[PDB]
């Protein structure tokens, strides 16, 4: 029914026992990869409440960012070594599904060590994953399956929801990403803009931009080759992601402070946990693995990106029109700002267009705006208001609030 | 040398006696006119401090918003009973005076009750109060003299400005305005901008605007004709500011939620505070003067706004070369966004203009950036990152910093 080896017993740091099952161990993906999971069965009638993966993206980073730092039911104190419960975990309404991916990451791994990979084959991979958590679960087969995961992820789950769309043994039934990487040229475009509106470009370099990348009211910050214009974009590029400023979260403090872990980030508590031998012993993973870090270097080196759009992917999998899709963004991330997404799903073009809304949360405080929601026919976009790229550290209650809306195929207003 | 009888003496709330020496009173400005003051000296060598003048804006609204909730000596709690002293108030290294101003706005007053006025009596009347202050406060004559203010007094500050610099006795030496009205027209068309790019407008209207309110790379946001630019524009409006967004800071709660005070603002914690019979006593504030507003609704009806720009006054200003000008804005503001002001300076076509560069602060945490700066001679432009409307309130270490550097015409980076 579930495997009892993967249980984990007693989880270090936790001052109460969960009141639901969880399970640490491996899903074989192709060749010789050893993908790491952790599974985290929903707090409500975990029987028949749906299957949810989550992946974090990179290339190279861990998914237990999501589930330590981000939605999972307990989340890491600066300590390293205390974990709280956290109430607006994702798990409250769903069977949470971990997965470090690709081989390499954090305790995923390869008998053969060899981590250089592309999207074609991270999403066979992850497949086949998937197909052996179910071999390794039989009794969630039939639960409503969705894919989601954040940023990267943006590639890795439709490539992977269109294999998935193939395979009528899963239960398919949606797919949410999180300040998703959906088109490189969509994001380098809006974040010209996104630098200039949030105060971070002055007027001399706006005209001249303008000037050099433009033409009438389009503007091309994507593969422009105008010389003058290829020197402004070199100094916004310096300004937004070298110089100091959070590019995760424009108004957040950058980890460490201004310069002279990805610059910004800190991911200290996280690492000092995972990396406790107690943790790895209740977490079943063999002590001939090299040590966890947050993101592999290697994997991140070596990895061949080979899409630069997912239109493609979208419109096949809104073609059958059985899975229901939410893109949403923080709308203050300029890694991957939630214009570029915005502009994304609506070049999509699909029926069924609703006018754009504010969509609300219920706080203390009253109701407020969590964010605006522009809907189409088996798809919306969302915005997350005031939070950065790890929506559900940022706005924890918006965060689950839309993602029970979404699980339910609710209204997001 | 100074008004004995309007020295605060014991102020309820306080748990400690301020090392400083504070005063409550009434300044006379024109016709029968008494405008309420309320002065604190530096914490640091007042003798020698320099003196400055704080309003804040409405039309209507009182100065103690300054001192009691954004950067007094002492900040009041939400029980609007306790007041707590504060770290980065403006009073460490000044002595700041603050006026609750037209007549009318809070304890101010006038014998005839007659509060309709306009921008030109409003100079005319303060000038003449900051001379009665002078009269009894003669000791600060020779004192530097910075005018500063916030919002509406965008027009109140550089339009006294201008009045002062007519009088050598004044030691006048420059002039700080947050968030400042300087241009309608540069306010109303920088304003839509920054509705669409945070995310507040999607394609749609974006389209419409651009295609009906704007011709080539010029868009008309303010006193466009065209019949759809209008309707677009009344949207625009609706959105920012009349659906449950805080437009003094876009990522905040509105106060009390969503509808069905300003909307969204809840000045109940200094109303109760000011309300309290024994501290209007400790104020030296008369027994038959009427309640405590924040703002006054009969000043703010019948207020006759008279300038448009403050390009002509500004100008003046700057031609002598006496005068450092500073204009400061929290980048998320919507009342008085900051990309209007910085087109605004940007427009006065100074010298001496420098690079822009990001401005620091130090916090454990390390260096952070602060904003950005845009300098010219004797004027900056400076953003506060992530403070709205009310800067000090938002990021008082900030605030507190920039102000230091402008007081101490230090370099703002
Ligand atoms: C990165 O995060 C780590 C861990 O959260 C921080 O380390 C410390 O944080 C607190 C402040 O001293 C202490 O209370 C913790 O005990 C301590 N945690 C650990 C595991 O050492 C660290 O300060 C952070 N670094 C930066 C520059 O932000
Ligand atoms: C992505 O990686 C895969 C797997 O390494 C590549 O697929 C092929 O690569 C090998 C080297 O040429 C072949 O020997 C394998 O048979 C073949 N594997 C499969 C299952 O197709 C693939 O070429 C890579 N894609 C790109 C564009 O680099
Ligand atoms: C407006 O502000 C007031 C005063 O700060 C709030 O009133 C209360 O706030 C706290 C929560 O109940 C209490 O601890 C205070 O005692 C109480 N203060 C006073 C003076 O009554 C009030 O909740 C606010 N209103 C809204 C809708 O935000
Ligand atoms: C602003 O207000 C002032 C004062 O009320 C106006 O100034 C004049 O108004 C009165 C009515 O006409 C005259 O009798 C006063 O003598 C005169 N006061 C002074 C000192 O000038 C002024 O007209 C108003 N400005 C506008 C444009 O309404
Ligand atoms: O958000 C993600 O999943 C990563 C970045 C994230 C990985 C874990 C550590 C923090 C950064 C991406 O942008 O692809
Ligand atoms: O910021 C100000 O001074 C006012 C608004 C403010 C007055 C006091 C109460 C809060 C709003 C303005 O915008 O002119």
């Known amino acids: 029914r579930a495997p009892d080896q993967d249980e984990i017993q007693r989880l270090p740091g936790l001052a109460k026992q969960p009141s639901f099952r969880q399970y640490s161990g491996y899903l074989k993906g192709s060749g010789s990869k050893h993908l790491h999971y952790w599974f985290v069965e929903s707090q409500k009638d975990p029987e028949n409440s749906p299957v949810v993966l989550w992946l974090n993206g990179g290339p190279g980073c861990s998914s237990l960012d999501g589930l330590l730092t981000e939605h ?7 300590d390293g070594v205390t974990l709280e419960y956290n109430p607006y975990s994702w798990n409250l309404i769903a069977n949470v599904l971990y997965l470090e991916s690709p081989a390499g990451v954090g305790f995923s791994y390869s008998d053969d060590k060899f981590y250089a990979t ?11 994953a998937l197909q052996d958590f179910f071999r390794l ?11 989601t995961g954040e940023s990267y992820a943006g590639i890795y789950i439709p490539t992977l929801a269109v294999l998935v769309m193939q395979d009528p043994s899963m239960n398919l039934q949606g797919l949410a990403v999180g300040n998703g990487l959906s088109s490189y040229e969509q994001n380098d475009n809006s974040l010209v803009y996104f630098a200039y509106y949030h105060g971070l470009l002055g007027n001399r370099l706006w005209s001249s931009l303008q000037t050099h990348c433009c033409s009438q009211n389009k503007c091309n910050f994507y593969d422009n080759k105008d010389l003058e214009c290829v020197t402004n974009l070199q100094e916004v590029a310096r300004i937004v992601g070298n110089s100091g400023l959070n590019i995760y979260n424009l108004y957040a403090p950058c980890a460490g402070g201004v310069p002279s872990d990805p610059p910004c980030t800190n991911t200290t508590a996280a690492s000092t946990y995972l990396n406790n031998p107690y943790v790895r012993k209740a977490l079943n993973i063999p002590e001939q693995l090299p040590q966890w870090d947050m993101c592999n270097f290697l994997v991140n080196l070596q990895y061949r990106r080979l899409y630069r759009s997912m239109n493609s992917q979208y419109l096949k999998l809104l073609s059958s029109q059985k899975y229901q899709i939410l893109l949403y963004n923080g709308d203050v991330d ?3 700002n939630f214009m570029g997404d915005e502009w994304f799903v609506d070049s999509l073009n699909q029926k069924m267009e609703v006018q754009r809304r504010p969509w609300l949360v219920k706080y203390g405080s009253g109701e407020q705006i969590a964010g605006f929601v522009k809907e189409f026919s088996h798809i919306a976009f969302l915005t997350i208001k005031g939070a950065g790229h790890m929506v559900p550290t940022d706005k924890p209650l918006a965060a689950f609030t839309m993602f029970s809306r979404f699980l339910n195929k609710q209204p997001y207003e």
């Open 118 to 128: 592309n999207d074609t084959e991270v999403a066979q991979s992850n497949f086949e």
């Open 137 to 147: 679960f039989p009794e969630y087969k039939n639960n409503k399956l969705f894919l």
């Open 334 to 336: 300029m890694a991957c």
């Open 72 to 78: 999972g039911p307990f989340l890491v104190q600066p």
